[PDB]
């Protein structure tokens, strides 16, 4: 919708309800992903490359604490290549990484705020 309406505050309030905390949810950004190659923060490198055993950020954030709320702040700024991964996060509820382990988002909450419109009905 518009700016300043409090979308992120609604998400933090929702996380405040069913956790009695406010920082246990998983916020990431979509403003740091303006180029093509930074997709691999949330996957991990294939076998043979520099950071391999460390794993993915978004993947490791769910193998522990598998009940989080996941945010995507201002998902417009990412040029249309990050969208190919959350095309398959949704509707299957799985994602894989370098090790071939399969995380499962089958009881998480996906909340992805946007910024478009802003003046129309």
């Amino acid at each position: 919708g518009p700016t300043g309406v409090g979308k992120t505050e609604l998400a933090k309030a929702l996380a405040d309800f069913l956790f009695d905390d406010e920082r246990a949810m998983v916020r990431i950004d979509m403003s740091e992903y303006g180029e093509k190659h930074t997709v691999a923060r949330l996957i991990g490198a294939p076998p043979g490359y520099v950071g391999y055993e460390a794993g993915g950020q978004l993947t490791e954030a769910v193998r522990r604490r598998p009940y989080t709320v996941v945010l995507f702040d201002e998902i417009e700024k990412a040029h249309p290549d990050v969208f190919d991964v959350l095309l398959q996060v949704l509707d299957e509820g799985r994602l894989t990484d370098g090790h071939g382990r399969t995380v499962d988002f089958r009881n998480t909450i996906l909340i992805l705020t946007s910024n478009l419109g802003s003046g129309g009905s």
Partner: peptide, 26 residues
């Protein structure tokens, strides 16, 4: 009037290996 009969022994210590971890250079 017994003897000594100096017995033998066997030794072992293995080796390591390294991995190179190429960098994609962009």
């Amino acid at each position: 009037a017994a003897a000594a009969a100096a017995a033998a022994a066997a030794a072992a210590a293995a080796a390591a290996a390294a991995a190179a971890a190429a960098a994609a250079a962009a």
